Amino acid sequence: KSMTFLLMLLLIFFYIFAVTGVYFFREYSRSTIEGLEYNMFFSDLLNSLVTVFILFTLDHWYAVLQDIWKVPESSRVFSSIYVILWLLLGSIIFRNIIVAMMVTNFQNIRSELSEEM
Amino acid sequence: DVQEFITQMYIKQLLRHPAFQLLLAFLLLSNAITIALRTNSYLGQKHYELFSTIDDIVLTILICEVLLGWLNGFWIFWKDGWNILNFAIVFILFMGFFIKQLDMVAITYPLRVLRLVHVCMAVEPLARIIKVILQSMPDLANVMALILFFMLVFSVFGVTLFGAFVPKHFQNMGVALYTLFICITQDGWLDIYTDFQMDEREYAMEVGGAIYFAVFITLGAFIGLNLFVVVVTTNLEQMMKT
Amino acid sequence: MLFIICLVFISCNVLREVKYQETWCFPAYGMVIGLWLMLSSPQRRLVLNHTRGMYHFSIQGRTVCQGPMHLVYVRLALSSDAYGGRFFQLVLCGHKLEPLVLVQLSYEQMEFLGRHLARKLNINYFDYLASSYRHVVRHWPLGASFSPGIVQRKTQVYTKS
Amino acid sequence: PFPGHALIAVATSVVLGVLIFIAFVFQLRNIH
Amino acid sequence: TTVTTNSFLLVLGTNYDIQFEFFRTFEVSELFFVSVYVCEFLMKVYVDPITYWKDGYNILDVIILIILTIPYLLRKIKGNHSAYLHFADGIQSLRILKLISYSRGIRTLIIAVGETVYTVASVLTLLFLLMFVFAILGFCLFGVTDRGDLENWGNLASAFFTLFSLATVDGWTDLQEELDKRKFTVSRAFTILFILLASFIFLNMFVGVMIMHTEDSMKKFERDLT
Amino acid sequence: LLGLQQMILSLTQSLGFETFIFIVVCLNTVILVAQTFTELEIRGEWYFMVLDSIFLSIYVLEAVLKLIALGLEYFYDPWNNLDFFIMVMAVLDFVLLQINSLSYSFYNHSLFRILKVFKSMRALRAIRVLRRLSILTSLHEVAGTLSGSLPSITAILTLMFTCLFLFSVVLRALFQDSDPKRFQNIFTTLFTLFTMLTLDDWSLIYIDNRAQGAWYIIPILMIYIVIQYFIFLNLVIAVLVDNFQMALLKGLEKVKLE
Ligand SMILES: COCC(CCO[C@H]1CC[C@@]2(C)C(=CC[C@H]3[C@@H]4C[C@@H]5O[C@]6(CC[C@@H](C)CO6)[C@@H](C)[C@@H]5[C@@]4(C)CC[C@@H]32)C1)COC
Ligand SMILES: COCC(CCO[C@H]1CC[C@@]2(C)C(=CC[C@H]3[C@@H]4C[C@@H]5O[C@]6(CC[C@@H](C)CO6)[C@@H](C)[C@@H]5[C@@]4(C)CC[C@@H]32)C1)COC
Ligand SMILES: COCC(CCO[C@H]1CC[C@@]2(C)C(=CC[C@H]3[C@@H]4C[C@@H]5O[C@]6(CC[C@@H](C)CO6)[C@@H](C)[C@@H]5[C@@]4(C)CC[C@@H]32)C1)COC
Ligand code: NA
Ligand code: NA
């Protein structure tokens, strides 16, 4: 109940990163290279949102990034900036704010129990 | 005796002076940029004359600063840690002129960047982080000792189980330690377990290896490797309090 | 500073004979050698003429200066550090002699021989009767001529509020 | 040739170190 | 309602079918929205010459309008429908961010959280410095040697990426094995000690600093309210 | 029963009996750490079996004598209970060895090795030796606070296992024959969910399913990850931090007590 609005910031940021990853990676999803692996992750909006979740969990971020690089289009300065800023902001800060909040709430519960004692 | 205190007063008002610190920081920062640019074969040559000049200018200034520090008394300069660190860096840099097997980039470049941390210390919104790390280090040493002493026993058990079976990961103590360090990092042990699974026909030891990995990952990855957090918080609260 | 003469001259000898076997690198460590003998030269012996309360400075049997010691007491001035440190400097009677500062102050036996010496020299040991922090009152006998500092000597001294 | 980077190195240091020395003397005349 | 409808149309804009049918809807709506935001900015600074710049959210909102303007002029005047047209076209993904100025609870959250940004920026500077030191090592050892692992430690643009993949421990063993097939003796020690310093000791210090800064802030707010 | 048992006691808790046994156990553990190279174990195989039969006889001595001395009080203490279980494993693998032919087909039999690892458990006794010499108690404090934390750690751990188990049951029910290589069996369902809980290659199973089966697994996996990694493990972190905070306040008040 305490961290109710934090989840609303996360929902906003999934909106942000998903609907901008649809646009950043369009020549990548519209690609004809005979050999590719992750040609789907940015196909539509739903795929973009699940992709943002996968990046949020720090699974195969570097592999997906290299796949994006394997297209001669999709300049390596926008894909790189997008992925790295999502990993830093979304994946390391936000995942850590949750832990901070839950430790704070345990501290609170301790405080009320101690004062009632 | 009356006079030299003023000279000592002068030495303090110079060395501790902030314009001097800002200049030395500017030089070391420019040298770090030069190191980054030398990490490129093309630009390695074109401005080789400039990079070499800057390389030597910063070293001479570092030596001058160590001389000033020694000028205040050998012992008090050595009654610190940051001074001995800066001295070690400048000395390793200096011996390159005389000796030949040390004046190589793998030993001379990154030391000029380890020289930068004591510079960053003057930026105390930064310095408190370093002070927390240093203060909490012994507790992290104890936790590290716990984790290693835990890992050795499971390494013994894992070798004496999966020796003469999957010897790509479980022959001797060292290979097993590296495997368990893969696991405790929780990335890429699924590939390791596929080696248990990859056989012509087997069922009895896939389950045993799975049990082994599950117990190690529960007790050591979810509990032991989530103890550095707690040590840092412990010490940093201690500083915030005292 | 004969210890430095003792120090450098030894270094020169170990540097006197060597085989560098390197192009250029002329063996010119002799620039040290002069610095060795330089500080070597004249023993200093100071006698406390407490009979008339006098102090005459000389070394190797040649008088340099003299001055009475009517007001006699032990004082040690504070030599603070640029780091968070405390160091000791001993200035007795407001004069400029060889520093008798507290060695290894940062020592109980070191200060013990001083109390006997201050008892042997028949002067007060102010920094010893109460030895916790910077607490000494310089005597500064009226025989000295340290007016910009002798009067200022009490200025740095705390009057205990 | 070698004696032309160690030399520039010592040149700047001493050229700087003089300006440092300037202030130390200059301050003495100001207090006086 | 203006901002919410803008976000909804933006969402529907990532489908070329619906972008085609009802395209005139999209055009008229986009021009309507830009008109509304600019009129809001102009008249809200009309009411107040100087103090308008006091508010942080006012700065955020004029920044939003700037980001709104940029790709328009890029596409119209400079033209070329270039490589990075649709990049800045999709960067108005974040002009929903005007919607944060309204929910009071999120504003209090912004206070409690974003008052701990100097600590975050400090830890990020230190992490970057550590990655730089080790990128120089990793280049000097496994890079320029020409007998071992170019193009993964070939240059800092790649040394940082491999070293970050070791920080966030995702996939470090693949790089380690492709660096170990080249008979490098010290590589295991290098990677293991980097994993210690940067993953165990460093991010698990980020979490500690976050915990206690947020805790102290939150307890101060609670005490004040009580 | 009063003099014989009593002298067995006063010889058992004797300050030489303990040192003799710790010498035995440190020798057994130095052998047991010798045996993990394959360059020494293969050479010195014939002496190791001799030494290990010797150690089995010694442990017969100690276990029987301690039981006769201290009745069920011997069964009472868990340090010994560990030793008794180790003893049982040793005697069982001894008799099993004698009731089989010591050949290659038994070297490569899994049960032979499984019975052999429990011999590795003897090295645990070595900690008792390290305790008397001292570990320096450098980790006495961390161990004490882990000791304080465990009661709630067990509870949250079993709660998250329960969540694992329910999701595993439902995933087995639903997603058979959509990548049977992953969870064609209930046990491999449960292991797949457990290994998801560490987030290693967890997208790979989504992609693998989407390739041939179907993608309904994506909301299940997203909700799974939310619950387990995002709200449960962070509970473990939170409770550990709070426990060490209590330890710190105790230390602060204690040091101010003096
Ligand atoms: C009843 O009161 C007792 C009290 C004194 C308590 O001392 C304790 C000191 C820490 C210590 C030695 C104790 C029990 C569990 C011990 C842990 C069990 C684990 O075992 C290991 C080693 C073996 C591995 C198989 C598993 O991990 C270690 C990593 C872990 C361990 C050995 C770390 C040290 C712990 C005893 C005094 O009271 C008056
Ligand atoms: C300092 O004095 C302490 C004393 C009280 C001592 O109590 C002991 C009771 C047995 C007990 C719980 C103790 C330490 C090691 C424990 C063993 C370590 C192994 O760990 C396990 C589980 C975890 C696995 C990874 C390895 O195996 C168990 C099989 C094994 C174990 C848990 C069996 C039980 C042992 C503590 C009171 O003194 C006044
Ligand atoms: C001084 O007297 C103390 C006594 C109370 C003693 O309580 C003990 C209860 C068992 C307990 C919690 C204790 C110490 C070592 C603890 C073990 C260390 C290992 O650490 C772990 C977890 C962390 C991993 C890195 C390694 O393994 C556990 C598997 C192992 C452990 C946590 C199992 C539980 C043990 C304290 C009261 O006396 C009056
Ligand atoms: Na992975
Ligand atoms: Na991972």
Swiss-Prot record, chain A:
Subcellular locations according to the entry: Cell projection, Cilium, Flagellum membrane
Signal peptide: none
Superkingdom: Eukaryota
Residues in the Extracellular compartment per record: 25-43, 57-76
Intramembrane spans: 44-56
Mutant phenotype after disruption: Mice are normal but males are sterile. Male sterility is due to defects in sperm motility unability to fertilize intact eggs. In mice lacking Catsper1, the sperm lacks CatSper2, while in mice lacking CatSper1, the sperm lacks CatSper1, suggesting that stable expression of CatSper1 requires CatSper2 and vice versa.
Transmembrane segments: 2-24, 77-103
Tissue: Testis-specific.
Functional summary from the UniProt entry: Pore-forming subunit of the CatSper complex, a sperm-specific voltage-gated calcium channel that plays a central role in sperm cell hyperactivation. Controls calcium entry to mediate the hyperactivated motility, a step needed for sperm motility which is essential late in the preparation of sperm for fertilization.
UniProt record similarity statement: Belongs to the cation channel sperm-associated (TC 1.A.1.19) family.
Quaternary assembly: Component of the CatSper complex or CatSpermasome composed of the core pore-forming members CATSPER1, CATSPER2, CATSPER3 and CATSPER4 as well as auxiliary members CATSPERB, CATSPERG2, CATSPERD, CATSPERE, CATSPERZ, C2CD6/CATSPERT, SLCO6C1, TMEM249, TMEM262 and EFCAB9. HSPA1 may be an additional auxiliary complex member. The core complex members CATSPER1, CATSPER2, CATSPER3 and CATSPER4 form a heterotetrameric channel.
Organism: Mus musculus (Mouse)
Name of the coding gene: Catsper2
Curated annotation (Swiss-Prot), chain B:
Whole-protein residues included: 51 to 292 of 442
Transmembrane region(s): 17-38, 49-75, 80-103, 107-125, 139-162, 206-233
Activity regulation annotation text: In contrast to the human ortholog, not activated by progesterone. Activated by intracellular alkalinization.
Source organism, top-level taxon: Eukaryota
Organism name: Mus musculus
Extracellular side, ranges: 39-48, 104-106, 163-172, 185-205
Record's function text: Pore-forming subunit of the CatSper complex, a sperm-specific voltage-gated calcium channel that plays a central role in sperm cell hyperactivation. Controls calcium entry to mediate the hyperactivated motility, a step needed for sperm motility which is essential late in the preparation of sperm for fertilization.
GO cellular component: acrosomal vesicle; CatSper complex; sperm principal piece
Keywords, sorted A to Z: Calcium, Calcium channel, Calcium transport, Cell membrane, Cell projection, Cilium, Developmental protein, Differentiation, Flagellum, Ion channel, Ion transport, Membrane, Spermatogenesis, Transmembrane, Transmembrane helix, Transport, Voltage-gated channel
Cystine bridges: none
The name this protein goes by in its record: Cation channel sperm-associated protein 4
Residues on Cytoplasmic side: 76-79, 126-138
Protein family according to the UniProt entry: Belongs to the cation channel sperm-associated (TC 1.A.1.19) family.
Null mutant phenotype: Mice are normal but males are sterile. Male sterility is due to defects in sperm motility unability to fertilize intact eggs.
Intramembrane segments: 173-184
Catalytic activity: Ca(2+)(in) = Ca(2+)(out)
Bilayer topology term: Multi-pass membrane protein
A GO BP entry: sperm capacitation
Chief subcellular location: membrane
Expression sites by tissue: Testis-specific.
Location(s) in or outside the cell: Cell projection, Cilium, Flagellum membrane
From Swiss-Prot, chain C:
Membrane topology: Multi-pass membrane protein
Organism superkingdom: Eukaryota
Subcellular location: Cell projection, Cilium, Flagellum membrane
Transmembrane annotation, as ranges: 3-17, 29-40
Matches recorded under InterPro entries: TMEM249 (IPR027861)
Keywords for the protein's UniProt record, in alphabetical order: Cell membrane, Cell projection, Cilium, Flagellum, Membrane, Transmembrane, Transmembrane helix
Intervals, Extracellular compartment: 18-28
Annotated GO CC locations: CatSper complex; sperm principal piece
Segments on the Cytoplasmic side according to the record's topology features: 1-2, 41-161
Main location: membrane
PANTHER family in the cross-refs: CATION CHANNEL SPERM-ASSOCIATED AUXILIARY SUBUNIT TMEM249, TRANSMEMBRANE PROTEIN 249
Function of the protein: Auxiliary component of the CatSper complex, a complex involved in sperm cell hyperactivation.
Subunit structure: Component of the CatSper complex or CatSpermasome composed of the core pore-forming members CATSPER1, CATSPER2, CATSPER3 and CATSPER4 as well as auxiliary members CATSPERB, CATSPERG2, CATSPERD, CATSPERE, CATSPERZ, C2CD6/CATSPERT, SLCO6C1, TMEM249, TMEM262 and EFCAB9. HSPA1 may be an additional auxiliary complex member. The core complex members CATSPER1, CATSPER2, CATSPER3 and CATSPER4 form a heterotetrameric channel.
Name of the protein this chain belongs to: Cation channel sperm-associated auxiliary subunit TMEM249
Gene responsible for this protein: Tmem249
Curated annotation (Swiss-Prot), chain E:
UniProt keywords, alphabetically: Calcium, Calcium channel, Calcium transport, Cell membrane, Cell projection, Cilium, Developmental protein, Differentiation, Flagellum, Ion channel, Ion transport, Membrane, Spermatogenesis, Transmembrane, Transmembrane helix, Transport, Voltage-gated channel
Superkingdom, natural source: Eukaryota
Tissue: Testis-specific.
Parts of the chain on the Extracellular side: 15-23, 75-86, 139-159, 180-185
Regulation: In contrast to the human ortholog, not activated by progesterone. Activated by intracellular alkalinization.
Segments on the Cytoplasmic face: 51, 104-111
Membrane topology: Multi-pass membrane protein
Key word Transmembrane present: yes
Assembly notes: Component of the CatSper complex or CatSpermasome composed of the core pore-forming members CATSPER1, CATSPER2, CATSPER3 and CATSPER4 as well as auxiliary members CATSPERB, CATSPERG2, CATSPERD, CATSPERE, CATSPERZ, C2CD6/CATSPERT, SLCO6C1, TMEM249, TMEM262 and EFCAB9. HSPA1 may be an additional auxiliary complex member. The core complex members CATSPER1, CATSPER2, CATSPER3 and CATSPER4 form a heterotetrameric channel.
Protein name: Cation channel sperm-associated protein 3
Organism lineage string: Eukaryota, Metazoa, Chordata, Craniata, Vertebrata
Full-protein interval shown: 58 to 283 of 395
